[PDB]
Amino acid sequence: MNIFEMLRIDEGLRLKIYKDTEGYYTIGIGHLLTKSPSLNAAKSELDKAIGRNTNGVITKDEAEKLFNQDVDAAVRGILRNAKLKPVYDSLDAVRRAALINMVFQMGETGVAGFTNSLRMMQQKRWDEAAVNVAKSRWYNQTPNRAKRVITTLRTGTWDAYK
Ligand SMILES: [Cl-]
């Protein structure tokens, strides 16, 4: 198991513009296109992203390219983040994976906001951090997913992903 497979599981794959859990226009593997309520605006963004006149549909390959780019941006975001970098450096490999997931899902800023959880993560207090991170909108909106990420964070293994 690795970050790519893990996220592929959490996000799915769709070749057509669709709406995410929050109603945002998205495509491929969890690639947010826009928070605007306009399908057109989303088609616009999509074309710009792909470099061609898509008409709201992409290929598997195109989806994978977006995904590679997104995973890459997530890691770099982490490493460039003053709050995040130090947590990340202190973690083992499975756990780092869990941090990248959260960041891919909610944005660097978003995650950088979990001040208290981050401290616990850094202090290696697994159970506390798991509990704390659950008291969040993130968990309440997408509980099953959140649960897989939290278990990964807590245990340091891939069990949740069986
Ligand atoms: Cl869910």
From Swiss-Prot:
Known catalytic reactions: Hydrolysis of (1->4)-beta-linkages between N-acetylmuramic acid and N-acetyl-D-glucosamine residues in a peptidoglycan and between N-acetyl-D-glucosamine residues in chitodextrins
UniProt effect for mutating residue 20 to A/N/S/T: Complete loss of enzymatic activity
Effect on the protein of changing residue 11 to Q: Complete loss of activity
Subcellular location as annotated: Host cytoplasm
Pfam families per record: Phage_lysozyme
UniProt-annotated binding residues for substrate: 32, 104, 117, 132
InterPro entries: Endolysin_T4_type, Glyco_hydro_24, Lysozyme-like_dom_sf, Lysozyme_dom_sf, Phage_lysozyme-like, T4-type_lysozyme
Highest taxon in the source lineage: Viruses
GO function term, MF aspect, one: lysozyme activity
Effect on the protein of changing residue 30 to A: Almost complete loss of enzymatic activity
EC code(s) of this entry: 3.2.1.17
Active site residues of this protein: 11 (proton donor/acceptor), 20 (proton donor/acceptor)
Keyword line: Antimicrobial, Bacteriolytic enzyme, Cytolysis, Glycosidase, Host cell lysis by virus, Host cytoplasm, Hydrolase, Viral release from host cell
Consequence recorded when altering residue 132 to M/F: 2-fold decrease in enzymatic activity
Family (UniProt): Belongs to the glycosyl hydrolase 24 family.
HAMAP family linked to this entry: ENDOLYSIN_T4
Protein name: Endolysin
Organism: Enterobacteria phage T4 (Bacteriophage T4)
Lineage: Viruses, Duplodnaviria, Heunggongvirae, Uroviricota, Caudoviricetes
